[PDB]
């Protein structure tokens, strides 16, 4: 089965009217005149048609008409074609001067195009060679919607060949809320989920997505979807692994179109275990990102270990490692005071299988060596305090020193 639209339907009767660019358009266009990224930005504002129009059809309601995006490449031509059957633009929106005019540019030796809006409007031609003029006629045959010719630069002319469009288009457009067609081949779209409200997403369906973002066969011990606009628009999804970890990579999107697949530095250093995908409408900004989502992400887990102790308890046997890092590696004694309110220790307030919260150690810190309840329930360092008044904490662990030093203090305590 091969469905496309794409083919030549168009022509120009009369003479086109050359244009100039304004002052600043230019001096854009020429600083432009990192290499792929344009498609994912044809693909976005394609769908942006798209969504502008459906949302005008319901609104009457006559029945929906068929609403892809199409891809289509020439090799003897040299050429990459892009055609939406979206809401299209008028003649005022052509000449009227905003992503993706410049990547087109930034591959493009020059551009044709072919609008026509919904209102039954006529059909335009829209030219330019990247300087200054731009020309534009009405012109015959032109199908609804927007179709976008490019004529390649010599030197960007690999997206000129099938093999090397795919890719691009699986990584970035992959979630795209229409069909979209490379040269009639549907190309896969999975349900963006992150956008949706967190209740109305199936426990399947948060497993079905954990499988895709993570490439893992098991399923999420833990799940967070984190949808909130007050700080930034972010539609997020968290999932924790449920084994034992043994040897950040949470994607980053934006509107459905990847930005980055493995965000370094999205989330802080120790919270590298979370797959799993944050989203936002808002394309040295993530300083501001990165500390807030942490924020929910402490949240949950104190807020876990509130629900369900045991499982929080596996957890935090499995992953109390990077809990320490956390610890060790922050700088900021408050947010190192955040994470240690979900490490978790035993202590003589009762045998082997209590897991003690320093928080709750409020009730009078001291702490001994590791590994054994056997080697701390008899140190001449640890009797001597029991023979003394005060309750010890029994770390048990060996990376724990470094890290309850490192954390040098709890709440004004002297740890
Ligand atoms: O990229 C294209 C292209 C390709 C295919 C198309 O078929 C269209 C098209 O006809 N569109 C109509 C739209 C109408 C709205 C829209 O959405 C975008 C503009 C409104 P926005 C927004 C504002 C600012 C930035 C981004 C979006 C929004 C953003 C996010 C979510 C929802 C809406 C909004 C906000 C509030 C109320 C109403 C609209 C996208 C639209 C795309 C454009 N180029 C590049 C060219 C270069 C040279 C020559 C020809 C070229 C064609």
């Known amino acids: 089965p091969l469905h496309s639209i794409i ?25 432009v005149a990192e290499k792929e990224v344009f498609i994912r930005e044809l693909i976005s504002n394609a769908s942006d048609a798209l969504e ?20 289509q490449t020439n090799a003897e031509k040299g050429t990459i074609t892009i055609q939406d059957t979206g809401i299209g633009m008028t003649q005022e ?44 006629a009405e012109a015959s045959g032109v199908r609804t919607g927007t179709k976008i ?44 989920i992150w956008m949706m409200d967190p209740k109305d997403v ?11 973002v993570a490439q893992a066969h098991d399923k999420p011990r833990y799940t967070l979807h984190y949808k909130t606009d007050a700080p930034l628009n972010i539609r997020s999804i968290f999932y924790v692994p449920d084994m034992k970890p043994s040897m950040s990579s949470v994607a980053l999107y934006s509107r459905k179109v990847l930005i980055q697949t493995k965000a370094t530095d999205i989330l802080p250093k120790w919270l590298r275990f979370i797959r799993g995908v944050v989203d936002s409408e808002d394309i040295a900004l993530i300083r501001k990102l ?23 308890a596996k957890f935090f046997e499995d992953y109390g490692l990077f809990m320490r890092e956390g610890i ?19 202590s003589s307030a009762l045998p082997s299988g209590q897991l003690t919260s320093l928080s709750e150690y409020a009730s009078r810190i001291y702490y001994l060596c590791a590994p054994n309840r056997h080697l701390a329930e008899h140190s001449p360092y640890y009797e001597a305090m029991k023979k003394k008044d005060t309750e010890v ?8 020193e470094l890290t309850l030093l490192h954390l040098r203090e709890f709440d004004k305590k002297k740890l």
């Not at 949302?55 to 029945?63: E, I, P, R, T, Y």
């Not at 630069?153 to 992959?174: I, L, M």
């Open 93 to 136: 929106e052509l000449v009227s001067n905003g992503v993706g005019f410049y990547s087109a540019f930034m591959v493009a030796d020059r551009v044709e195009v072919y609008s026509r809006s919904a209102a039954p409007s006529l059909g335009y031609q829209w030219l330019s060679d990247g300087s200054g003029v731009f020309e534009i």
């Open 393 to 400: 904490l029994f770390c048990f662990e060996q990376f724990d």
């Open 7 to 31: 083919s030549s339907t168009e022509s120009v009767q009369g003479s086109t009217s050359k244009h100039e660019f304004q002052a600043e358009t230019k001096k854009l266009l020429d600083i």
């Open 328 to 346: 060790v590696t922050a700088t900021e004694q408050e947010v190192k005071e955040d994470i240690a309110k979900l490490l978790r220790y035993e």
């Open 290 to 312: 990165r500390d807030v989502l942490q924020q929910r992400l402490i949240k949950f887990f104190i807020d876990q270990s509130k629900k369900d102790a045991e499982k929080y």
């Open 202 to 212: 199936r426990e399947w369906q948060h497993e079905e997505f954990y499988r895709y």
């Open 52 to 71: 502008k129009l459906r949302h005008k059809l319901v609104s009457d309601g006559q029945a929906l008409p068929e609403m892809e995006i199409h891809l």
């Open 149 to 192: 010719i490019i004529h390649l630069k010599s030197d960007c002319k690999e997206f000129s060949s099938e093999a090397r469009v795919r890719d691009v288009v699986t990584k970035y457009s992959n979630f795209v809320s229409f069909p979209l067609y490379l040269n009639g081949r549907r190309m896969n779209t999975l349900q963006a």
